[model samples]
Target: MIEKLAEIRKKIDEIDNKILKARWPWAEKLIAERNSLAKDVAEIKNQLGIPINDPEREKYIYDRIRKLCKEHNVDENIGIKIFQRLIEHNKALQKQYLEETLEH
Candidate 1:
């Protein structure tokens, strides 16, 4: 029985390494996709007349994100970080627009 348990543990460790190795390509793909989505979000913000600095809107966004995280078993910290980045990127785009308009 002890020998069988040891063999099972060794197999599990090998499987874990294989899974991790398989995910490396997926990680790279997700990074590119995330950047594209962030840009799209910035454009949507500009179209909607939504300023990123609005605290009330930020709170609403965060609340919905938290609920989705809970429903999907996603980590809350990751959700918060992603949402915050989206808001910051939107603000950066808005700032760029303001600077360009002022220059003209």
Candidate 2:
């Protein structure tokens, strides 16, 4: 039991290193790019008087992500949760851009 526990801990530590050292930087870059598009989306929404949250669009996004997660062998629940947070964060970013536009 102790040997199995030690092996599991070691495997997790190796995964942690890979995620922090390699995956994190690339993930940060993509997130940065995604956030940068928020201003453009905000502008277009303003022009069209569209709301930030679109359930239909979100459903489409989730459906696409579900396929991606299956293809990538990722846990669907965890993957969806991550995307939900990403969508929420982008909405907040769009709101900030809108507020700034109003302020100026």
Candidate 3:
């Protein structure tokens, strides 16, 4: 029992390190690109009179992510929570940008 537990722990730690190492750079690039699209998003929103807080788009995001997590056999709850916070942060940033230089 002791040896088996140690083996599992070692495997989990090693896999987690690899996941983190691979994901960190991918996350950084994607995050930068997403945030950098703020201006274009605000511009289009102003031209179309679309609201900054888009529930439909958010729902689509949730659905897609939930499906993706399921496909990978991971917990969707964690993804939902992560996306919720990410959406909220994006909303805050979008709001800031929207208030800056856009007009209808």
Per-residue lDDT tens digits for candidate 1, residues 51-88, read 63456856776676666556545456755675566556
Q: What is the lDDT of residue 63 in candidate 3?
A: 71
- The better candidate by TM-score, 1 or 3, is 3
Q: Please report, in order, the local distance difference test score of every candidate based on alpha carbons.
A: 0.49, 0.58, 0.54
Per-residue accuracy of model 2 over 10-99 as CA lDDT, tens digit each = 443343223233333333224544455555666766666678666786687677666656664545587667666756776788788889
Task: Summarize candidate 3's per-residue lDDT along 1-104 as a digit string, tens digits.
Answer: 12442343244333332323333343221333344454446556666677777788678766766665655555557656765665576577878887766453
For model 3, the run of ten residues with the poorest summed lDDT: 20-29
Which one wins on lDDT? 2
Steric clash pairs (candidate 3): none
Candidate 2: clashing residue pairs, number: 0
TM per candidate: 0.48, 0.66, 0.62
CA lDDT for candidate 1: 0.49
What would the TM-score be for candidate 1 when compared with the true structure? 0.48
Better candidate by TM-score, 2 or 3: 2
Candidate 1, RMSD to the unseen true structure: 17.3
